[PDB]
Every structure is written in C-alpha cells, then in structure tokens.
C-alpha cells in the first residue's frame, strides 16, 4: 500500500481555543441516562453516529468492531428478558457486597425498562480475531482497547447529535446475546447502549466530575 | 447522593441529522499522524481537550484516569530513549514475525522522532485501583475500558481542535515510564499520544475504512 501527503485544515490559535471550549461544554452536558422515551429517532442520525465510530484508530488497522443495531421490539424484549435474568443473579450473588454497595449512589438494579422503551439498542461486539479473504485468521492487536476507543467516539457522536444513552456492561449476558443475534464465535459483546430521547421522567445521579488539576499532571 | 432531573436539550430532527453528518465528516478526516511539527500549541487547548476527556463515563463513576502532559524537552528525550530502546527489542524479537509483517503497510520502525519534535506528549495512565480518604483501596470497575473510552473522547477533541496525534501502545515501557514521571504504583500506562500540528512533509498510509454495511448490522 502507498503513502500519501497529509492534508490538514489549519485553525488560528484563537479559533482553536474557541472550538475546544465549545466541544468541552457540549460533551460535559452528556450524562448516562437510564430512562429513555419510546419516540422514534431518525435512522440517519444512527447511521452517521456509527459511521463516525468506524473512524476510530485500530491496532494495525484491523477495525475489529461490529455494531449490531436492534430496532425490532420483539428482539429487544428477548434481550431484556436475558439481561434482567442475569443481572438479578448479579445483584443478589455474583457481584458481591462491595460492588453492590458501590452502586447505591446510582440507584440501579436489575430492572431495565429502557431495553424495551428505547427505540434503538446498539450492541458493540469486539472481534477478538478476524479473517482474511483466504480464510486464515488475522490477529486483532489490542482489539478490546480499539473497540472501546471507538465506543468513546460513538458516545461523543450521540451527544453531538442530541441523543442520549447509558454505557452498559451486562455481566454474563454475552454468550446468550451473541447466540440470540446470530453473531459468529469470534465476536464477543463488549457493551450495550440503549439510544433515544430522554423520557419525561428522566433523572440522573447528582455526580460531580473531578476538577482539571485532579485528572491532569504537567511535568517539568 | 441525591438524584436530580436531567435537562433535555431540544433539537429539531433535521438539525440533528445535519449535526450528525458534519461530525462524521469531521472525524473521518482524522488520521494517525506520525510526523509532527515542533510549532508550539496553546496550553489552553490542551487543558480543554483533557477536560473533555474527563467528561467520559466511567464504571461506577470512578474516573480512573490520569493524563500526564509532558512539555519539557529533557523529559521528552528520556522518554524517547526508553521507547526507541524497547521498540527495537520489540521489532527484533518480542512482537514476532506475523505482527512485524502486519505492520509493514504502515512503514513504522523503532525510530520515533515525533517524541522529541512534538511540543507535547500526553501519557494516559489507567488507575487499576484507587484509595479512599481513609486509606482503604477502592475498586475501579472496568478501568481499562473506561480509560480507553476517555481516550476515544480525547482523540475526537484533538480532531475538533485541529491538532493531530497517533495513538501508540509502547510495549513493555510502562514501568520505566511510570518511575521516570513519578507516578504512583496504582497507575499503569495505557497509551501515549504525541500532540501538535502535522509537520509540512507529513504523510499517511493510503488506508481505506470499511463501508457502513461492513461494521453495522441491523436486526428484525
Ligand atoms: C465500562 C463502563 C461500564 C458501565 N456499565 C454500566 C452498567 O452496567 N450499568 C449502568 O447503569 N451504567 C454503566 N456505566 C455508566 C456509569 O455508571 C456512568 O458513566 C457513571 O455513573 C458516571 O455517570 P455519567 O456517565 O452520567 O457521567 C458504565 C460505564 C463504563 C465506562
Ligand atoms: C490500541 C491501539 C494501539 C495502537 N498502537 C500504535 C503503535 O504502537 N504505533 C503506531 O504507529 N500506531 C499505533 N496505533 C495506530 C494504528 O496503527 C492506526 O490507527 C491504524 O493504522 C489506522 O490508521 P488511522 O488511525 O489513521 O485510521 C494504535 C491504535 C490503537 C487503536
Ligand atoms: N508500537 C510499535 C509497533 C506498532 C506500530 C503500529 C501499530 O498499529 C501497532 I498495534 C504496533 C511502534 O510504535 O512502531
Ligand atoms: N450492570 C449492572 C450493574 C452496574 C450498574 C452501574 C455501573 O456503573 C456498573 I460498573 C455495574 C446494571 O446495569 O445495573
């Protein structure tokens, strides 16, 4: 493969500060929203939002991500049955006292109404390896990190397009959800995002983010 | 902690589509750039771009990320020695034939001039656990996925601010770099981004991203 010159849009120092400031204020309004309206969302916003995720870097240019988008209420309800079943066992037994205590501030439990109400579910699967045209396995270097980076870009895109979601990681729901949606064995579910508008009764925990001097360290 | 109403941001469906289209076109221009000018960048843009990263979701709201920013020519050079030294061993022995063959199309080698030329290096450390005020360890659920999500948001923010970078994972360099920059034992380096304007003669591999129908699957 050939190498080509890199073409860049140069911004004046003042334009950069402004764009960077606005983008921060924009994304800082993003909250994980666990209460989602059933009102339909324009499918072109979803398409672009996933196109964008696919612009993520990936280890050795492997693109090890599958974004499975579920619209069908029937399928969605089967997903809800599975996750609620496993989460109940997760809260009652598998996560442990410490974890369950650490979640009190979020008031979450194994009841997940948004899996039904949200018009759209995005299930993100990592490809723990891939296949070339000849059918031999190609290695997916840092696939979990690559897909997660892509999930970050997906989250920014949803915020930018004015939709809401919550990044969820349903423990022990992977194999079952994989089988239900007909995904191949080399795919493993990494996380699930319900996407839509906030329902009228939406709340969030009153969480505070660290001040800059607590996430950033400058060295001299 | 109390729970509060979530404030709905109201967009017309069409403005939403327009925003989603523009954001895709913006991020699709992002490329990993391994040739970086030494032209200084405004530290406020860095501050904002890192603020943005800190708005990322995190498992049970743990915010397990430390963004170390290195400006100092001297420290940067010590980092360069470390990474070039280890990458040489990586290409010659530790990565293996297949991996080295897989990197040919990128024309990368163990020489990393950008580590000196770039005005700023951002080293992203995951906190594999934390400490409460009482000195007991708190658990950082999915810290690596969380930090990676933050890095994704970071990459978008840099792209939006007209800065460039390449997402790097310097094999076996974590411990030496941790000690060099005086980071506590609960921090582990996840990746390194050289940040700045692209140098004049910068190139990129002519890579193609998958079409939408190859990363997205819709279900009924
Ligand atoms: C890796 C990861 C996994 C998460 N899993 C869940 C989950 O299973 N359920 C849930 O309600 N939220 C989950 N979240 C969302 C966090 O609880 C949320 O980000 C955190 O409470 C901070 O709130 P905020 O997103 O509004 O800033 C997850 C976040 C991350 C980064
Ligand atoms: C987890 C991860 C690790 C990476 N590590 C390196 C690295 O060590 N060196 C490097 O030159 N590029 C690294 N990259 C960048 C990829 O090589 C690059 O994203 C890929 O070739 C596609 O190019 P693009 O980002 O311009 O689309 C990494 C990317 C990811 C997601
Ligand atoms: N990290 C080494 C080698 C390398 C290069 C590109 C890439 O996508 C991956 I995964 C590894 C380096 O920096 O050269
Ligand atoms: N996944 C379960 C429990 C849960 C909830 C929030 C959170 O940040 C984490 I890490 C785990 C659920 O969805 O309830």
From Swiss-Prot, chains A, B:
Enzyme Commission (EC) number: 1.21.1.1
Binding positions for 3-iodo-L-tyrosine per the UniProt entry: 60, 87, 91, 112
Catalysed conversion reaction: 2 iodide + L-tyrosine + 2 NADP(+) = 3,5-diiodo-L-tyrosine + 2 NADPH + H(+); iodide + L-tyrosine + NADP(+) = 3-iodo-L-tyrosine + NADPH; 3-iodo-L-tyrosine + iodide + NADP(+) = 3,5-diiodo-L-tyrosine + NADPH + H(+); L-tyrosine + chloride + NADP(+) = 3-chloro-L-tyrosine + NADPH
Binding site for FMN: 30-34, 58-59, 167-169, 209
Cofactor section: FMN
Tissue and organ distribution: Expressed at a high level in thyroid gland (at protein level). Expressed at a high level in thyroid gland and at lower level in kidney and trachea.
Gene Ontology terms: cellular component: cytoplasmic vesicle membrane; nucleoplasm; plasma membrane
GO terms classed as biological process: thyroid hormone metabolic process; tyrosine metabolic process
Topological category with respect to the lipid bilayer: Single-pass membrane protein
Alphabetical UniProt keywords: Cell membrane, Congenital hypothyroidism, Cytoplasmic vesicle, Disease variant, Flavoprotein, FMN, Membrane, NADP, Oxidoreductase, Transmembrane, Transmembrane helix
Effect of mutating residue 46 to V: Activity as the wild type
Major subcellular site: membrane
One Gene Ontology MF term: oxidoreductase activity
Localization: Cell membrane; Cytoplasmic vesicle membrane
Family, similarity comment: Belongs to the nitroreductase family.
Disorder: Thyroid dyshormonogenesis 4: A disorder due to thyroid dyshormonogenesis, causing severe hypothyroidism, goiter, excessive levels of iodotyrosine in serum and urine, and variable mental deficits derived from unrecognized and untreated hypothyroidism.
Complex and partners: Homodimer.
Function comment: Catalyzes the dehalogenation of halotyrosines such as 3-bromo-L-tyrosine, 3-chloro-L-tyrosine, 3-iodo-L-tyrosine and 3,5-diiodo-L-tyrosine. During thyroid hormone biosynthesis, facilitates iodide salvage by catalysing the oxidative NADPH-dependent deiodination of the halogenated by-products of thyroid hormone production, monoiodotyrosine (L-MIT) and diiodotyrosine (L-DIT). The scavanged iodide can then reenter the hormone-producing pathways. Acts more efficiently on 3-iodo-L-tyrosine than 3,5-diiodo-L-tyrosine.
Protein's recorded name: Iodotyrosine deiodinase 1
Gene name, Swiss-Prot/TrEMBL: IYD
Full-length numbering of the shown residues: 71 to 289 of 289
């Amino acid at each position: 493969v050939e190498h080509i010159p890199f073409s860049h849009n140069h911004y004046p120092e003042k334009e950069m500060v402004k764009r960077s400031q606005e983008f921060y204020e924009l994304l800082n309004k993003r909250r994980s929203v666990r209460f989602i309206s059933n009102e339909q969302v324009p499918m072109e916003v979803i398409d672009n939002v996933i196109r964008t995720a696919g612009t993520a870097p990936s280890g050795a240019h492997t693109e090890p991500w599958t974004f499975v988008v579920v619209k069908d209420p029937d399928v969605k309800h089967k997903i809800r049955k599975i996750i609620e079943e496993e989460e109940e066992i997760n809260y009652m037994k598998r996560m442990g006292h410490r974890w369950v205590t650490d979640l009190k501030k979020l008031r979450t439990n194994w009841i997940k109404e948004y899996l039904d109400t949200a018009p759209i579910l995005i299930l993100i699967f990592k490809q723990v390896h891939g296949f070339a045209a000849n059918g031999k396995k190609k290695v997916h270097y840092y696939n979990e990190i690559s897909v997660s980076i892509a999930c970050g870009i997906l989250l920014a895109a949803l915020q930018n397009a004015g939709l809401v979601t919550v990044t969820t990681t349903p423990l022990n729901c992977g194999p079952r959800l994989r089988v239900l949606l007909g995904r191949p064995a080399h795919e493993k579910l990494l996380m699930l995002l319900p996407v839509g508008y906030p329902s009228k009764e939406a709340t969030v925990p009153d969480l505070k983010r660290k001040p800059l001097d607590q996430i950033m360290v400058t060295v001299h």
